[PDB]
Amino acid sequence: GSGKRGLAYNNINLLTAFEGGPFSWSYNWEPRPGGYTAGIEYVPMLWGPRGYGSWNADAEAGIAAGSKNLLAFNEPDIASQANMSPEAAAAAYQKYMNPYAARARLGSPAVSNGAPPKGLGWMQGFLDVCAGNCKIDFLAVHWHGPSGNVDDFKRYVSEAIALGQKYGIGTVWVTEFEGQGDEEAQVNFLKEVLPWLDSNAGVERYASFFVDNLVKGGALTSVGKAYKTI
C-alpha cells in the first residue's frame, strides 16, 4: 500500500492474522519487541521514566536489529500514562533520545487529543522547552473519539502537522487512532480516514488502535479485515 500503515500490539502472536497486508512497521509501547515478525520494522519506544534504566541498552539492540526509528514517551500529558511535565520531557528527551540522532529517526513524545493544556498544547510547551535542542525527526500523536467525530480527527492531525512544521519537524506519526462504537461504526470510520492518512503527506506513518482488539479468539474481527484491505 502506502507503506505508512502500522501494527500496534501487545501479543506478538496476533501479528500473523495481518500477514501479507500493507504493513511496514510495528510497535508495542515497549522498548523490546517480545519476539520477531518478518518484513516489518519494529520501532522501540521509550515509554516514560520507568524505562530510563534500560533505554541505552534497548536503543542499542534495536539499532543493532536494523530499526530505523525510535519513539519517545507515551502520553506525557495524561497522569496515568507517562505523566511528565513538558520541562521534564525536554530534559529527558535531550538526555535519552538526542544521542541516537545519528543512527535513527527520533519521534516526539506522543500526546493525546485532549484540549490545551493536554494534547498539542503540551506538545507546544515541550517544543518551547526543547529550545531547538531536541533532535526530532517526527511528532507522534494520538486521537480517540466516537466514529462520527471524523472531522475532529482530521483537524487534530492537521493541527499536529502545522504545529510540527512551525518548530521545523516535517512529518507526524499518528501512532494511535480509534473510531469508537459497534463493528460497522468502526469499519466506516476506517473507510474515510485510511485513504486520507495514506495521501496526507503530513502523515509519514500511522497505526489504528490496536491489533489485540482487532483480533479475537485467534481470528480477525470485521474491523481487523477492513484495516488489512482498505
Ligand X SMILES: OC[C@H]1O[C@@H](O[C@@H]2[C@@H](O)[C@@H](O)O[C@H](CO)[C@H]2O)[C@H](O)[C@@H](O)[C@@H]1O
Interface residues with ligand X (CB under 6 A) are 10, 29, 74-75, 81, 142, 144, 176, 209-210
Cβ-closest residue to ligand X?
29
Cell triple for residue 34? 517480545
Burial of 164 (0-12, 13-18, 19+ CB in 10 A): buried
Residue placing its CB nearer to ligand X in the complex, 58 or 75: 75
Neighbours of 195 (CB within 10 A): 12
Distances (CA, A) of 3 to 75, 144, 218: 25, 23, 25
CB of 12 to ligand X, least distance (A): 12
Q: Which of 139, 192, 178 is nearest to 161 (CA)?
A: 139
For residues 101 and 73, give the distance between their C-alpha atoms in angstroms, rounded to a whole number.
16
For the bound state, the minimum distance from the C-beta of residue 47 to ligand X, rounded and expressed in Å, comes to: 6
Contacts with 72 (C-beta within 8 Å, 6 or more apart), sequence order:
45, 46, 89, 93, 97, 106, 107, 108, 109, 110, 140
Contact 4, 24 (CB under 8 A): yes
Q: Which amino acid is at 127?
A: L
Q: Find the shortest distance in angstroms from Cβ 178 to ligand X.
A: 7
The amino acid sitting at 125 is G
Least distance between ligand X and beta carbon 214 (Å):
12
Q: How far is the CB of 180 from ligand X (least distance, A)?
A: 11
